[PDB]
User: What shape does this take?
Amino acid sequence: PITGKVTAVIGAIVDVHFEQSELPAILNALEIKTPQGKLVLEVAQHLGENTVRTIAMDGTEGLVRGEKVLDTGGPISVPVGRETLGRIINVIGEPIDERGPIKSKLRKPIHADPPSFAEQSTSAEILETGIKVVDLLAPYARGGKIGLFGGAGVGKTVFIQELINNIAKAHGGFSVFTGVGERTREGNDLYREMKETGVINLEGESKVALVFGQMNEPPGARARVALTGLTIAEYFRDEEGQDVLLFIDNIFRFTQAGSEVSALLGRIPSAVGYQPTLATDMGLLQERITTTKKGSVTSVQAVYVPADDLTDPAPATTFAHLDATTVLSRGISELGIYPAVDPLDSKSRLLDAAVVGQEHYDVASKVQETLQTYKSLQDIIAILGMDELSEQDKLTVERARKIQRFLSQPFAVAEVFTGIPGKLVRLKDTVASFKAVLEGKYDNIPEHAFYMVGGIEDVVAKAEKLAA
Amino acid sequence: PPPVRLFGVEGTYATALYQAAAKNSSIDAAFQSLQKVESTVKKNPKLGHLLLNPALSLKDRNSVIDAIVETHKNLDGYVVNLLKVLSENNRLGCFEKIASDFGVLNDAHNGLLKGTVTSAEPLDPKSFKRIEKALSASKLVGQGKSLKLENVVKPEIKGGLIVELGDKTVDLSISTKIQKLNKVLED
Amino acid sequence: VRYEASLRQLEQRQLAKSVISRVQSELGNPKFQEKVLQQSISEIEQLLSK
Amino acid sequence: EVSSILEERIKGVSDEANLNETGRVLAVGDGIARVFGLNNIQAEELVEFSSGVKGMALNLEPGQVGIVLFGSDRLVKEGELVKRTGNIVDVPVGPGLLGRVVDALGNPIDGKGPIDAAGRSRAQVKAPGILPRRSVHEPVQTGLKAVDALVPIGRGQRELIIGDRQTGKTAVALDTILNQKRWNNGSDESKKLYCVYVAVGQKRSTVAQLVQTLEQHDAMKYSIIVAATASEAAPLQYLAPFTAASIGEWFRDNGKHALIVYDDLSKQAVAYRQLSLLLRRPPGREAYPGDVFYLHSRLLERAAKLSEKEGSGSLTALPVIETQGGDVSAYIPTNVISITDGQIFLEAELFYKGIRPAINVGLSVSRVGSAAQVKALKQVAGSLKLFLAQYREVAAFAQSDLDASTKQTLVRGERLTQLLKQNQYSPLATEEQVPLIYAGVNGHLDGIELSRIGEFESSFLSYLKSNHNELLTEIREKGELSKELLASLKSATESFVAT
Amino acid sequence: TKAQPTEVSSILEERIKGVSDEANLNETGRVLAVGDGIARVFGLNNIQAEELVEFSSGVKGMALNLEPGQVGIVLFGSDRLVKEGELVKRTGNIVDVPVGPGLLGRVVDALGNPIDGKGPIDAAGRSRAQVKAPGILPRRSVHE
Assistant: This one.
């Protein structure tokens, strides 16, 4: 069998010298049986003389040089099935939810190629959500990558949970929360919250599958957690048809992990230190997220900008890949608005007069223009007084503060936590609500009574009952 | 392929030579002839000193090989093709480097270990035999892996001895014992 | 107390050069032979015990 | 005498050796002995030279193993037997390190005595999983009102202390240990925080003062001081937090709690830079290894508040990072900032303004929050945060003519700033933290002049003790503030403001 | 002493064994050290500079570094498909792409493979990728 003895351990770059004519191919997966169970090395070079240069996916401590290695022959094949759902699964495809051996029937190689032109999005359609704010002010796309901005404090995690529920209703989808550079504390919190909010119901169904990749996990395994998550997603899209939504945590820490492995590989750091292969690797990752004939993966990513130095290649390249960005604000949530979305920061290219229709585009522009004018108005309103400004001007401001309240809707997932039943509102009823609100028909109704509601119709009732 | 790796370092030459000449089964002949032509080459003072020296060109080196193949013929023509290769590779100083390595590979194939009894004095023939016996008695010298045990006298070591073989040494020298004793009586 | 402690250290250093003197005595005598012989047979005893 | 010492020393070279696998130095340069031999050799294995020095082998090269020396090159010389100790780096773990200043190996450098140890456990041990962890409910109290309330800290938690050296960087850390003396007295061993101070790149003269200070405040008896001094070699420095953590795991495992304060991981980084550069492994950004991030992540994620699965115990950590301008931009700060949950940002401006040690608590943050805060202390200090928040903004108009609202904020805020001043090595009980913040919140401090805040404090506390140390004892024991108790407290404070 | 791409044991063994290097290293190569989308091949002595080589991998590559008895190709193709010791055969032509008139209405990738799939290639000729731009005298005043 293909066997070789470890012939160097300079860093975590472990060179294995194999007996001749047992030729490997680049991107193979080697497994070294170890007292650490196994050490999984991934062949990333051939150094000739039937020697390799590999990266590690497991720790390299206590290695006695000359250890025999066995070559699987190709990229690690990571379990897939609906058995993976609700299971935190490690890079080596083993429980870190600790709910024991997954019964995932088939496993599939992690390194994989992006679909052909045909099986890439030729026309893009808007994947629906129950959140009206999302479907208006940053409509989610089919195949699209809409990269969330605005960290937890806006209820980011709860927002993400809401999305999982919405996706399930929306298509029939599933999700996979893949976490890169996880803080093991935060991972604990997420697992506990996710269990509680029933996106992972042990007895019940678990839509989201969890893959967490701690920072402590070696840089090679940090880079490969993302690809593993993606493989599950593509199994969902291609082999279960289902559209999925794949969260990624910091793609900055994705970058950092890739950058480190490049330097380890000896490859010269490119500008700002970031890897020379940054573009292509991201390119693969964000072109395996697209609309095939079957499903479509879509990816919501977290971008840990390096001190808002967007100019830097790692953010710039990230923004180059991201179709839309949803920019939740903590200011907004502090105005009591949950959704915490700040639409004067959230920007999408999926707001076009074709993508969502001309009427929607015009309506959106009006709602935005109302808010923009309202914001500027609030600047001088504080000194001048609203009542001292034009009847038209205070009409706008009054309508706006009511609109602002109308944006807020309880979240279905956290319905238990708030004690307030959430709202799942379809796109058509979203359009209807804002048109009427633009004509301010039922926007002659107090702000508090236009607060924390879904569709326009629902809040006609609430308006009356509040007054009564 | 070679039964043992010396991890190259011009042992890559030795390895290549080893397997090629092993299948030609002419490694003993090669080694002996290589030693023999080397002894009289080294004892040609010009190009037994200047052979080491890299003064020689490519073209001048090739002409050196022609002189060398006048010095002996045959006894593995793969080492004769090696001479050409080495002149072309312009290394002829790490020629004896390769010779030493080839000897190790050759005698490894034969299955023979070389040990040493570095000592500060030339020991008894009783001592020589007893150590040689002791090493075979221990599994350290396994069977089919022969022993050449060479006691050497080194002045640097002051008294006692260190037996070495199998990359395991037992050093019962006075110098080392003295080192620890001195240290603790200065600490 | 200070000088008493200093004197105690000085004694160790005085005896340190004496240790060196005693080392020279080992290396000259046919203790040099007899104890090397002892090391040889000791090495035999250990190595046969392997 | 000299003879008793001789017998000990000779006893210490009695019992002949019997060597096994050796290597021999080919050439030794720059703390990188390059050894021929050591065919079998665990990674991070300890090897002991014939110069007696110990090393680890970061490069295992194919035919030579490039040992890294933990000491001076003079000792080493060409052709030197390098015996293979055959044990990966391990350090004693056990209660014997309590009240002991030890070097990395574990040898008492204070020489207070050999370590009682139940194991020697390896230096780098993988982080405890998702499910081994549990939410942090227990607060840790530093006896500094601002830290305990404004920046609420728990046990298990890892939180940064990024600030400039010698502003009593060490002093801020030491204060916690002293308030933890109170808790230590408290029988439960989740309250007995067996603190570990990891002094990295710190001269022995300074560390001598530290050791003495701990002893003075009688806290050096549940303390452990891991010492890797300025001159102590870069392998020791590199592995010093790792080995130290393993000690911490023993406490955590036993269900006990402890606090490990790494000061400063910046010098741990520097040591790794020395190692990496000498091992020719490329130095990362700012000539500081790129997988220094990887090291920090491994080390800092062993700090955890366990679940009852692995017994609810913990290993609080407080890494200290030294900045020279507050340059968080710098690669080593950026990495650590990401890994830690919460930050304490200590600032120079405050120092000059008489807050010594000096903390800018506007720029301090917690990302573990008030879940690790006493319920009582939380209740009477929400208000404080908001008043101070306004105070920051309204400090930007302070320097004349001002609306009454702005001026009011300034009155409460200036008094509060004076109240939040603190001097080194003064811990303060929770039953006295709760009253002081209440007064400020009720604006009762406003009346008593700024200069008279100092006088107010001691007097107020004694007055509270005289009037009702029953109330104080209720705050401590109930741990909660009953409305009747705050009613009485409000009356008491008013009375105290009167006299 | 020094490192040479002929220190390789398989290279040395062929030489020591006095095995011939005609037309297997004059027009065929055998891959040596490969990784990082560049491959180092031994032989291909009749390789032209910037020729297109077809590997047995299937991968095609453009010679960049023509080195004494070695070539450092760039792989127009995944490293997955490439293994060490593959046989590299000269395509024999400088890198050219099909050029013609009937490419209108069809996407092609750089090689010329229609990646919309549509349009089975209709191209009159192929023309070398690097072409030195027309002279001063070739240019004339713009007006359209």
Notes: The CA atoms of residues 106 and 119 of chain E lie 6 Å apart.
